[PDB]
Structures are given as structure tokens and as C-alpha cells.
Structure 1
Amino acid sequence: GSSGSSGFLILLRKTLEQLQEKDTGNIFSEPVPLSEVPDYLDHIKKPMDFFTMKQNLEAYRYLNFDDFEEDFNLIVSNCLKYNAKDTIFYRAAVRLREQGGAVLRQARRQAEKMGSGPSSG
């Protein structure tokens, strides 16, 4: 595989590899096995995973940091929509929401520094 035809596009390659270091259980690293959950598509309206993130990125689908951030939030939320309030998988999605929530902040500022516009709040 190959990609990164613009300096903004290169940020997303290295950032996706930093979100992959926030899943130490490999729960989101791969797609949910339908062979043990055949009803997943009847309960989840927009299913996603880290392989689909990578494939979309290698297919030039992400031209703004907002969509790359929002599809990570979608992957977190799709766990929380199909689990019980006491499982490993539930708390693994809470772990991504916190730890990789920082990864999207530290990496957005590499685009904002060259996108220009206003500052502070």
C-alpha cells in the first residue's frame, strides 16, 4: 500500500498508527466477528473498525480532520450501543474515548498551524 499525497494527508497516516497504540486488547484493531454476533447489523446503524479507517484513509476519503475524529467517535459509540455496563469490551471503548481522545488533540494542531485563521477561546 501507498498514500500521503499532501502534508495534511501524511498527518493522518502517523495519527492512525498512534490510535492503534491505545487498543492493547486488539478489540477494535479488527472487525467484530459476525459468526458470534449475527444481530450486530440490526442494532448498529453505521458499523466501523480500525481496518475500515485505514482503507478509507488509503482511498483518499479524509480531506478534513473533523471526519477522521468523528469516525473514531463512531467506533467507540458502536461498542457502547452493543454491550452490558460491566464487560471488558465496554471499558475498552471507555479507554479509547479518554486515551486516544488526547491523540486526536495533539495531532489536529499539526493541521491548524498551516490552515491559518483565528486563535484562543
Structure 2
Amino acid sequence: SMEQVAMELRLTELTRLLRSVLDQLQDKDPARIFAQPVSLKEVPDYLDHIKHPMDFATMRKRLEAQGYKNLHEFEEDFDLIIDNCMKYNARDTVFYRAAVRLRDQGGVVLRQARREVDSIG
């Protein structure tokens, strides 16, 4: 149908906008602490602690499959990155501190993304 196409064009454009958001959030992680999945070879007990691991490469895979239907779903995954880290790692670690800085800096980007998503529809 023509409606299914129009819906698919909306999803494609959302994917465009979320790709730019993702790039901007990932720039706020210059140490690349959140770039890849925590290694189960190197942290073999991780899944005993963290039930839903997340990282920027995994989000990018979902993004490119047009797997985010709305901004809420994308934000859920970004919040998992931060929240998982703040639980597994102690306050006095470079990892925890990196997550706090990513959360704080990302807030700004996500605030305007929400306005754009609502604005453009």
C-alpha cells in the first residue's frame, strides 16, 4: 500500500535522525569505554550482575536494521549503557565517572532530539 510506504519513509527518516543522535552521544565517550560489549571472556561473571548488557556497537546494529520504532526505545538502550555501568562499577572508578559524564553531556542532545522528533512528527 501507499500507507505502508509512507510509514516506511517515516521510519527511515527517524533512523536518519537517531543515527545523528547516536554519533553525537558517542562523541561524549572519547575514551571509548562504551563502544563495545563488555567482554564475557574478560569479565566472566558479568551476566550474573547485569541482565540486559548494552553498548554503542549493539545499538548501532539495531539502528541500521531500523529496529528503533520511536525515540523512547533508543533512549531505553542508552540508559542501559549508563545504568549498567553505574551498578557494576564503584563510584571511585574511571568507568563510573565516564558514565556520569556521558549521562550529563548526553542529556542536552537528547533534550533537543525529543523536540525534533515531536516537531517533524
* Residue ranges of structure 1 left out of the alignment (5+ in a row): 116-121
TM value normalised by structure 1? 0.86
State the partner residue of 1:118. none
Map 1:106-121 → 2, pairs under 5 A = 106-115=112-121
1:43 aligns with 2:43: no
* Equivalent residue for 2:30, pick from 21, 24, 31: 24
Matches of 2:92 and 2:32, distance apart in 1: 19
Residue 34 of structure 1 deviates from its aligned partner by 2.1
Residues paired across the two proteins, number? 112
* Residue ranges of structure 2 left out of the alignment (5+ in a row): 1-9
1:57 aligns with 2:63: yes
TM value normalised by structure 2? 0.86
Does the residue aligned with 1:104 lie in a helix, a strand or coil?
helix
Would you say the 8 A contact 2:86–2:99 is kept in 1? yes
Q: Which amino acid aligns with 2:91?
A: K
Q: Do the aligned partners of residues 109 and 81 (structure 1) sit closer, same or farther apart at CA in structure 2, a change above 3 Å counting?
A: same
1:84 aligns with 2:76: no
Matches of 1:38 and 1:29, distance apart in 2: 19
CA RMSD of aligned residues (A): 1.4
Matches of 2:120 and 2:27, distance apart in 1: 26
Residue 29 of structure 1 deviates from its aligned partner by 1.2
Question: Percent same amino acid at aligned positions?
Answer: 62
Matches of 1:30 and 1:95, distance apart in 2: 18
Residue 85 of structure 1 deviates from its aligned partner by 1.7
Higher normalized helix content (fraction of residues): 2
State the partner residue of 2:3. none
Residue 25 of structure 1 deviates from its aligned partner by 1.0
Residue 5 of structure 1 deviates from its aligned partner by 5.8
